[PDB]
């Protein structure tokens with residue numbers, strides 16, 4: 001029994017045949033409250049998940065994703081398409097946890113990379129997996145760094161017409177206690 | 191095989207909140223005949239379609255006639271959405287050009303139906319919860335409260351539930367892969383042999399998976415252990431390259447992970463019960479009598 | 485494989501392998517493996533054949 005605040009109660013049932021049956025049900029309430037009740041013999045476990053978006057406009061935070069997009073503006077008829085975006089990043093909390101794993105680097109709405117493939121192809125800094133996702137970039141496994149490094153890479157304009165809101169590609173995990181340290185900047189050519 | 195008409199499009203992408211992208215449509219006549227095609231799109235209140243070519247109809251072209259046909263649209267909903275357009279050729283209008291046959295077969299009107307994704311506003315995540323209930327011929331009930339709305343975005347948040355017991359593993363496409371002797375180093379070799387070992391367990395266990403590549407991975411493992419003969423220590427410990435570091439211990443995940451399977455691997459090629467007791471007896475030594483040894 | 489061998493020499497030495505375990509290093513693995521090979525040959529009741 002899946003009962004909610006809004007006078008709502010959906011029932012389900014399970015057996016040897018419903019064993020393998022996924023029973024998906026959602027609700028639209030801003031109230032999130034989930035009373036349940038079952039019966040029978042043995043133990044069994046159900047699970048929940050609550051999807052939602054975040055980061056409308058976060059405020060600044062400890063970590064430094066150093067990204068720079070282009071010469072400060074398109075301001076020319078040829079631009080909005082070819083602009084190499086240079087990204088330059090290292091957090092300091094780097095101690096005795098693991099090898100260098102984390103990154104995320106993706107495209108904005110309507111922008112296709114090529115040479116970005118080839119610049120990642122080049123980079124290798126004393127040790128590297130030459131790892132790649134074909135929408136992202138993975139040259140990270142190495143020893144603890146106080147430095148950063150950087151790179152630069154452009155796109156081609158896949159979208160001629162684009163409503164105003166940016167794309168931002170951030171993942172930021174350094175230490176359990178502190179805030180999780182985001183740093184950001186979008187594309188200005190708009 | 192042939193069609194004289196085919197539709198190319200603007201694949202939108204998983205796109206931004208503001209949904210006014212650039213949707214176009216283009217059909218091209220590869221038949222030599224100039225034919226009128228009456229066209230429109232099937233829309234809904236699920237989005238805010240906008241007529242770019244409001245007053246005038248994209249009308250008529252000839253063999254390989256290039257025309258770009260687009261509209262503006264700024265949806266309301268989020269998630270994957272299909273877009274249905276239709277393009278039909280009508281008769282009795284020999285006026286767009288000199289003439290218009292417009293007499294196709296059962297593939298009369300060209301219609302295209304396109305699932306495009308819209309990405310919502312903001313960075314995406316979820317929150318879940320985990321609840322069991324185990325009545326033993328009885329009854330148990332639980333309550334779960336589902337709320338963390340700080341710094342919230344418009345109409346963004348939803349949720350669901352399920353439970354499962356699945357049987358019948360279909361398949362194995364998750365299974366296969368391979369790597370080798372690590373060209374860069376003998377350092378990443380620890381992450382080589384470590385999962386390499388329990389591939390023994392899968393050859394036959396799986397009934398979907400590819401045992402042969404795991405029956406190859408033993409072909410490798412018939413060398414894998416030989417490195418561990420080299421990566422061990424004389425006193426008995428193990429390192430990335432082994433001994434020359436005496437009065438110390440080392441990591442034990444890998445030796446603990448393996449030393450069983452060294453004993454499952456002690457069938458095909460022979461490792462002794464000396465290699466396992468020496469591993470062991472090295473362990474017994476590190477134990478203090480009272481303290482959780484430093 | 486499934487056999488034993490003479491033991492005068494190994495018994496004669498395995499001590500001095502442990503007196504010789506000062507100058508150049510032989511492990512306490514080399515002596516317990518020698519040993520544990522011996523414990524196996526013992527029956528539970530019979531003076532093993």
Ligand SMILES: *[C@@H]1O[C@H](CO)[C@@H](O[C@@H]2O[C@H](CO)[C@@H](O)[C@H](O)[C@H]2NC(C)=O)[C@H](O)[C@H]1NC(C)=O
Pocket residue numbers: 144145146147
């Ligand atoms: C990054 O900073 C660390 C800080 O520990 C440097 O490591 C040592 O720094 C001390 C001074 O704090 C020096 O006396 C040592 O010679 C440094 N080396 C070591 C490993 O002890 C480190 O050199 C800096 N560079 C990187 C990339 O780690």
Ligand SMILES: *[C@@H]1O[C@H](CO)[C@@H](O)[C@H](O)[C@H]1NC(C)=O
Pocket residue numbers: 271272304305
């Ligand atoms: C949209 O198209 C996809 C792929 O053809 C299909 O799986 C899905 O059911 C369609 N959704 C509809 C019919 O709205």
